[PDB]
Amino acid sequence: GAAQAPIVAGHPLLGSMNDLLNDPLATYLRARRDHGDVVRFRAGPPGLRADIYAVFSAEGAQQVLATESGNFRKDNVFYGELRDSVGNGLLTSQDATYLRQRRLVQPLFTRRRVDGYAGQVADEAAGLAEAWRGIPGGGVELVGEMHRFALRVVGRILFGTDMETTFEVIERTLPLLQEYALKRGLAPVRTPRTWPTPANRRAARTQAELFALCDGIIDSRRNRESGEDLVTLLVRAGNAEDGSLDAAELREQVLIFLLAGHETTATALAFALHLLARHPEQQRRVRDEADRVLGGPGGRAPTAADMEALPYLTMVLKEAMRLYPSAPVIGRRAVADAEVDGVRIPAGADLFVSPWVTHRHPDYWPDPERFDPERFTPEAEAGRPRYAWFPFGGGPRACIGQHLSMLESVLGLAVLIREFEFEAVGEEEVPLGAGITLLAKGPARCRVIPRSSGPRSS
Ligand code: HEM
Numbered sequence: 001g002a003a004q005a006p007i008v009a010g011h012p013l014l015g016s017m018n019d020l021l022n023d024p025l026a027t028y029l030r031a032r033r034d035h036g037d038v039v040r041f042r043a044g045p046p047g048l049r050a051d052i053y054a055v056f057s058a059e060g061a062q063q064v065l066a067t068e069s070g071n072f073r074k075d076n077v078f079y080g081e082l083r084d085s086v087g088n089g090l091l092t093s094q095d096a097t098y099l100r101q102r103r104l105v106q107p108l109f110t111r112r113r114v115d116g117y118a119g120q121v122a123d124e125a126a127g128l129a130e131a132w133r134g135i136p137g138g139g140v141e142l143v144g145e146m147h148r149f150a151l152r153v154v155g156r157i158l159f160g161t162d163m164e165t166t167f168e169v170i171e172r173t174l175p176l177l178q179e180y181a182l183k184r185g186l187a188p189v190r191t192p193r194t195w196p197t198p199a200n201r202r203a204a205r206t207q208a209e210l211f212a213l214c215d216g217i218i219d220s221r222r223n224r225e226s227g228e229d230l231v232t233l234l235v236r237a238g239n240a241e242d243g244s245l246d247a248a249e250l251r252e253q254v255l256i257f258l259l260a261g262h263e264t265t266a267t268a269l270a271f272a273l274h275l276l277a278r279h280p281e282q283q284r285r286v287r288d289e290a291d292r293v294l295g296g297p298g299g300r301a302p303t304a305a306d307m308e309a310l311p312y313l314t315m316v317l318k319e320a321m322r323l324y325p326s327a328p329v330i331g332r333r334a335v336a337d338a339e340v341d342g343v344r345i346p347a348g349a350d351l352f353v354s355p356w357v358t359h360r361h362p363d364y365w366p367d368p369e370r371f372d373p374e375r376f377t378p379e380a381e382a383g384r385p386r387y388a389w390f391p392f393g394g395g396p397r398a399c400i401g402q403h404l405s406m407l408e409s410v411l412g413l414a415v416l417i418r419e420f421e422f423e424a425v426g427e428e429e430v431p432l433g434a435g436i437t438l439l440a441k442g443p444a445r446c447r448v449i450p451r452s453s454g455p456r457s458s
């Protein structure tokens with residue numbers, strides 16, 4: 001009964017190669033509009049790469065990530081390039097290797113443990129507010145500012161008091177390593193990393209610098225409510241059935257927490273603020289809520305308990321992640337033949353599900369380009385399929401850092417909203433690109449007007 005997937009319209013020789021280089025996100029949206037919810041992207045010339053399938057329905061995303069998750073593995077080439085760059089930690093590992101890591105790391109990400117990091121988030125957000133009050137011109141570029149803030153937040157939680165000493169190195173090296181692996185990962189032709197090309201030599205130096213830094217911090221904590229940092233918790237990980245992580249395993253988990261938690265949260269934070277800067281009525285609503293909860297400009301630090309008291313900001317962040325999903329595609333590889341929405345996905349095919357497309361699917365989202373936090377009332381959520389929204393994925397390999405990201409984002413943004421008015425400036429439309437991560441192709445310019453002189457004793 002299963003139909004052949006339609007080939008997305010492209011170049012007669014080169015298939016979708018030029019369209020995916022120039023504008024992948026528009027290409028994905030066109031693919032759904034013209035060809036349906038299960039499609040295939042063809043490369044050219046023939047033989048360069050097998051056809052890549054895509055699944056855009058909420059039902060199909062649930063099937064691939066959850067219902068039939070065992071048939072859709074992390075066997076894409078780009079996963080192997082990530083393993084080669086950061087080790088085979090929680091995001092890339094599979095089978096028994098993954099089950100050991102999950103048993104050892106899931107305890108570190110209980111709601112209560114993650115909540116204990118609220119003061120680190122609050123403190124870093126107060127530090128950013130102090131920095132912004134200090135800008136003579138009152139102007140920022142939100143992509144860059146949130147890239148820096150999000151790394152400081154995840155660094156504080158991983159390394160505590162040692163965040164400041166290691167920040168510069170991670171800030172400079174981590175992005176270069178990710179670019180090398182993901183660009184290698186998506187390229188149909190690549191060199192062995194053993195070739196001494198300039199790019200391989202540059203990558204090997206960067207990897208060596210970052211590995212030595214991580215190894216030193218980890219070895220320092222190997223001697224080991226609680227404000228304990230996450231590497232200390234990783235060093236302490238263990239149970240009656242699984243012994244502790246070794247040095248190689250500790251390094252691979254520290255690197256994946258940084259990689260998986262830095263730019264993802266940064267993108268959500270930047271665009272939430274940019275959207276509020278372009279939508280004053282929604283900004284007024286979040287300000288009124290933050291002022292009620294924290295007692296206005298110059299008021300108190302937010303706490304973990306305040307998450308339940310900031311529902312509107314929480315809806316704002318969900319809507320920002322609907323429109324600007326940090327993982328716009330999620331890749332898998334089919335083991336055996338499958339059928340999604342009456343369409344065949346053959347054994348061995350690479351495929352992707354797409355928060356980008358599903359978050360804009362007209363079947364689930366009226367006026368899908370419109371920014372509307374009220375889409376995330378409990379009632380509005382019940383009126384759409386479960387996987388209409390899935391920026392953190394879903395099922396057995398869903399983001400372990402979802403709640404942490406929301407603690408960082410809700411508490412961090414509440415401080416900034418308590419302390420600044422945001423005014424968009426310049427070109428307010430931000431062009432986007434994408435690989436497996438969302439790419440800002442323009443600035444999110446913003447004027448930040450202080451609401452107070454900052455903290456004052458009482
Ligand atoms: C808004 C921010 C974030 C987004 C959009 C996001 C997105 C995702 C997605 C889509 C996945 C699933 C990938 C797949 O199924 O192949 C994932 C997994 C993961 N994320 Fe996040 N993430 C975010 C924040 C964080 C943070 C702060 C951490 C810090 C620990 C983190 C760590 C991870 C890890 C370790 C995994 C692998 C989980 C597993 O396989 O069990 N993420 N993330």
Ligand SMILES: CCCCCCCC/C=C\CCCCCCCC(=O)O
Pocket residue numbers: 091178259260261262263264326327328329330331436437438
């Ligand atoms: C791993 C799934 C394949 C692509 C989906 C992306 C979802 C995984 C998590 C986060 C987004 C990007 C993947 C690499 C993590 C790095 C974080 C980043 O810089 O985006």
